[PDB]
Design a binder for this molecule. Structure first.
Ligand SMILES: CN1C(C)(C)CC(NC(=O)C(=O)Nc2ccc(Cl)c(F)c2)CC1(C)C
Ligand SMILES: *[C@@H]1O[C@H](CO)[C@@H](O)[C@H](O)[C@H]1NC(C)=O
Ligand SMILES: *[C@@H]1O[C@H](CO)[C@@H](O)[C@H](O)[C@H]1NC(C)=O
Ligand SMILES: *[C@@H]1O[C@H](CO)[C@@H](O)[C@H](O)[C@H]1NC(C)=O
Ligand SMILES: *[C@@H]1O[C@H](CO)[C@@H](O)[C@H](O)[C@H]1NC(C)=O
Ligand SMILES: *[C@@H]1O[C@H](CO)[C@@H](O)[C@H](O)[C@H]1NC(C)=O
Ligand SMILES: *[C@@H]1O[C@H](CO)[C@@H](O)[C@H](O)[C@H]1NC(C)=O
Ligand SMILES: *[C@@H]1O[C@H](CO)[C@@H](O)[C@H](O)[C@H]1NC(C)=O
Ligand SMILES: *[C@@H]1O[C@H](CO)[C@@H](O)[C@H](O)[C@H]1NC(C)=O
Ligand SMILES: *[C@@H]1O[C@H](CO)[C@@H](O)[C@H](O)[C@H]1NC(C)=O
Ligand SMILES: *[C@@H]1O[C@H](CO)[C@@H](O)[C@H](O)[C@H]1NC(C)=O
Ligand SMILES: *[C@@H]1O[C@H](CO)[C@@H](O)[C@H](O)[C@H]1NC(C)=O
Length: 339
């Protein structure tokens, strides 16, 4: 017998104590080794309600990632609340590793195994586990990278679809590779991302058909972000310690919905910190080829308001709230206390 509850989680990883890579260094001091023989108990005739949008596991992961970035990625100049911090900004080894979240004694994690589970409401196939699967703390906007895929159909997630102010998470069931490169040797901040247009347009077409099921067969239209900070209007992510900002206008092409799509990107030193600590200037890029190949496994969308009297619904790539990134992986878990 159990009940919904929050508690202090701990983390587990397969980090190497000899690695200089910052995620390894953090997890070495902050996490324990993973369980080689994880146990999972499938419950019968159990109905449990879940709510990915109000899940304390998300806040805790956010706190971990903030801590990790604080100890690892130091900008040359910090501009937080009037005060200005000048400090050293060495180039680091950066590559996210899977982090597992685990409950202490007296608590268990319930896992929803329904194939079409949207993140909220009752779940019929529930199991109890001691730790979540390995989740890479990938910080990005617009596109969710290196995540897990939906096992069956594409899933649409939202706290309230009728509320256009609520972010929509699209969970893909098939990944699409995005290949980003800052050439070696010139504009040292110029870069680009390559995507297979055939693969992407097919997936995007399926996303539209899925959105139709949720919006009463209205016509689905994609548009580039209306405005805001560069972190929102562009697909921003971190590759090898360098902050990439990529223009995704070509990705959401309504006409296409087959060749290589090349997105124009820039490496930026001056960034609005996702932690919410204001603005910061990081160090200039390293020399040589800077390359990251990632799997697109999710999309963050914001729906246009004021379209009730039309047959169209307009969706733009957006987001910015990094907690949503963790929600896209933590949606199927919740903590309960055992009695
Ligand atoms: C709290 N708040 C929210 C989350 C509400 C929105 C917004 N978010 C970002 O500016 C942001 O996420 N930037 C960013 C930076 C680097 C990378 Cl790599 C990236 F992906 C994104 C501003 C702040 C103040 C942080
Ligand atoms: C629930 O999961 C079981 C396997 O654990 C499966 O046999 C069953 O079809 C699932 N029920 C649903 C979601 O229809
Ligand atoms: C998720 O499922 C719940 C319960 O069936 C439902 O109320 C809600 O509308 C669904 N959300 C989405 C995004 O389909
Ligand atoms: C990228 O996607 C492929 C196909 O789903 C997968 O085999 C590979 O492990 C993924 N790489 C990751 C998760 O970084
Ligand atoms: C992804 O989901 C869609 C329905 O949303 C389905 O038609 C398609 O077969 C799925 N793709 C794969 C490879 O399972
Ligand atoms: C969802 O959003 C709509 C529009 O803001 C609102 O009228 C409605 O009350 C919301 N539904 C819930 C369950 O809060
Ligand atoms: C990434 O793109 C570069 C060319 O821009 C290419 O040399 C490399 O093979 C690509 N990587 C993958 C995984 O296709
Ligand atoms: C792009 O993806 C398609 C499958 O959708 C594949 O057949 C084709 O080889 C890919 N293009 C390249 C250049 O790899
Ligand atoms: C969309 O149209 C199909 C016919 O292809 C219909 O069966 C279905 O009920 C419609 N869905 C919605 C949500 O309006
Ligand atoms: C993306 O590129 C298009 C085409 O050049 C341009 O019109 C648009 O302003 C760019 N978006 C951003 C946010 O820079
Ligand atoms: C959308 O695709 C069409 C078809 O090639 C292309 O001509 C156009 O440039 C694209 N629109 C964009 C990315 O603004
Ligand atoms: C995604 O995972 C791949 C394979 O581990 C890695 O090379 C790439 O840098 C990752 N992308 C991001 C943005 O972390």
């Amino acid at each position: 017998v159990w009940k919904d509850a929050d508690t202090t989680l701990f983390c587990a990883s397969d980090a190497k104590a000899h690695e200089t890579e910052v995620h390894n260094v953090w997890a070495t001091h902050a996490c324990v080794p993973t369980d080689p023989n994880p146990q999972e108990i499938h419950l019968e005739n159990v109905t449990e309600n879940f709510n990915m949008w109000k899940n304390n596991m998300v806040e805790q992961m956010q706190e971990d990632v903030i801590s990790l970035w604080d100890q690892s990625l130091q900008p040359c100049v910090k501009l937080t609340g009037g005060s200005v911090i000048k400090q050293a900004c060495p180039k680091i080894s950066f590559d996210p590793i899977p982090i597992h979240y685990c409950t202490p004694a007296g608590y268990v994690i319930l896992k929803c195994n329904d194939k079409n589970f949207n993140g909220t409401g009752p779940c019929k196939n529930v199991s109890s586990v001691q730790c979540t699967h390995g989740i890479k703390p990938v910080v990005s906007t617009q596109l969710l990278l290196n995540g897990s895929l939906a096992e069956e159909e594409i899933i649409i997630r939202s706290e309230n679809l009728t509320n256009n102010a609520k972010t929509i998470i699209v969970h893909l069931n098939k990944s699409v590779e995005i290949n980003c490169t800052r050439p070696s040797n010139g504009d040292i901040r110029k870069a680009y991302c390559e995507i297979n247009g055939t693969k992407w347009n097919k997936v995007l077409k399926q996303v539209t058909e899925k959105l139709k099921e949720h919006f009463n067969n209205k016509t689905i239209i994609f548009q580039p972000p209306s405005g805001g900070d560069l972190e929102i209007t562009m697909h921003s992510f971190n590759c090898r310690g360098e902050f990439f900002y990529c223009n995704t206008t070509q990705l959401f092409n309504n006409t296409c919905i087959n060749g290589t799509i090349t997105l124009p990107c820039k490496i930026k030193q001056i960034i609005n910190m996702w932690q919410g600590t204001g603005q910061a200037m990081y160090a200039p890029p390293i020399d040589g080829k800077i390359n990251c190949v990632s799997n697109i496994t999710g999309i963050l969308l914001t729906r246009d308001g004021g379209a009730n009297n039309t047959s169209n619904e307009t969706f733009r790539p957006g987001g910015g709230n990094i907690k949503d990134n963790w929600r896209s992986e933590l949606y199927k878990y919740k903590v309960v206390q055992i009695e």
